[PDB]
Amino acid sequence: MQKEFRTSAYHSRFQTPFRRRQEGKTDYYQRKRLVTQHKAKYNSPKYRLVVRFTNKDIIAQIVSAHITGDVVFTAAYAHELPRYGIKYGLTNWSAAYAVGLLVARRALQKLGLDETYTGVEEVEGEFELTEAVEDGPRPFKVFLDIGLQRTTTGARVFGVLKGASDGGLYVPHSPNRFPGWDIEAEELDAELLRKYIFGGHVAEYMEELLDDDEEKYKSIFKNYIEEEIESEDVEEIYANAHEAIRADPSFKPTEKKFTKEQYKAESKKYRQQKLTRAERQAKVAKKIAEFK
């Protein structure tokens, strides 16, 4: 009764979007605004703080864009945190802060701006931008790229923002998206932000749940229970880690149990291979014959 829609003319004239737009991964509007550089700053690149959250990981990368593809400057992942003393909640807001601090310190180590631009060594939750030192190199400027992730006051991407800013990177930002921002009274409650930086919300959930629903507390906070970690010693886990993160921010790759060639040989066994032209021609001939 109605016209069939998926005609050959519909497919012929269809203009497929960009490959990474059809995957639903790149916002090219925002990417154009982020990447494009002042044409009179000829080959000087703009550096992006790419912050991406998976279900299990926090990925923070410092990226500059080029014609052949983006180039990573440094990268810090959340699964590196166990090396620094944070083993659970690798996607906290506080894990986001730790990852931001780690990537900031690692980048500054790579550049050589460690002793200059230390950052906020005593985290009190106050809004602050890395100010340049007179008669010295300017701080490493980095712009936050939150991708498709929505901008909400209290979001975890701004945890990486605050960590990287406190780590010594100059990242332009405002404090009205941090947890503890009063929108009615336009000031930042730095006490609540400091609470969030050192896992205060998680510790308060542990304390509040333990005396109300112990069975749910046993399932949600299992790892803490078998690690004998109570609420009162949650903060130190982050507070020490920060210090440890500042002590040795260098990247240590995981020692690989197998070589590249062994990985490739193992994976190649489970990969179907395209039929040769002769194989599918023989298949067609057989299907014709069995049709008589």
Partner 1 sequence: ARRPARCYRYCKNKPYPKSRYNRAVPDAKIRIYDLGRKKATVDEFPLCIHLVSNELEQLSSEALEAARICANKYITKVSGRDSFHLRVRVHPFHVLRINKMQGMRGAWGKPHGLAARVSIGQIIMSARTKDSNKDVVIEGLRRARYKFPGQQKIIISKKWGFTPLNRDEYIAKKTNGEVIDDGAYVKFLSRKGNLEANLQQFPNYQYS
Partner 2 sequence: GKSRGYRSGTRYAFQRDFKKHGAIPLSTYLKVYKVGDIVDIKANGSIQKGMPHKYYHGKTGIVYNVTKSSVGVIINKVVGNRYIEKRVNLRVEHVKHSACRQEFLNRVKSNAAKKREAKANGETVYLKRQAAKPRGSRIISTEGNIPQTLAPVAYETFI
In the complex, the smallest distance separating the C-beta of residue 243 from RNA, rounded to whole angstroms, is 20
Which residues on adjacent β-strands are paired with residue 50?
A: 61, 145
Tokens of 162: 């605050």
- Within residues 41-100, the interface with RNA by CB under 7 A covers 41-44, 46-48, 50, 52, 54-57, 59, 61, 63, 65, 67-72, 75, 77, 88-94
214 phi, psi to nearest 5 deg: -75, -30
Binding partner 2 (rule: CB under 8 A), the pick from 6, 32, 256, 274 is 32
- 149 touching Mg ion, by CB under 5 A: no
SS3 56: coil
Q: Which is nearer to partner 2, 16 or 272 (CB)?
A: 16
Q: Which of RNA, partner 1, partner 2, none is residue 291 near (CB under 5 to 8 Å by kind)?
A: partner 1
- Within residues 65-84, the interface with partner 2 by CB under 8 A covers 65-67
In the complex, the smallest distance separating the C-beta of residue 260 from partner 1, rounded to whole angstroms, is 43
Q: Given its phi and psi angles, is residue 81 left (phi above 0), alpha (psi -120 to 50 degrees) or beta?
A: alpha
Q: Which of partner 1, Mg ion, partner 2, none is residue 284 near (CB under 5 to 8 Å by kind)?
A: partner 1
SS3 42: coil
CA dist list (Å): 29 to 5, 23, 206:
30, 15, 42
* One-letter amino acid for residue 20 of the chain: R
- Residue (of 161, 85, 155) closest to 120 by Cα position: 161
Residues near Mg ion (CB under 5 A), total: 1
In the complex, the smallest distance separating the C-beta of residue 110 from partner 2, rounded to whole angstroms, is 23
Task: Give the count of beta carbons closer than 10 Å to the beta carbon of residue 118.
Answer: 15
- 30 touching Mg ion, by CB under 5 A: yes
In the complex, the smallest distance separating the C-beta of residue 10 from RNA, rounded to whole angstroms, is 6
- 217 touching RNA, by CB under 7 A: no
Cα(165)–Cα(59) distance, integer angstroms: 16
Q: Which is nearer to partner 2, 17 or 137 (CB)?
A: 17
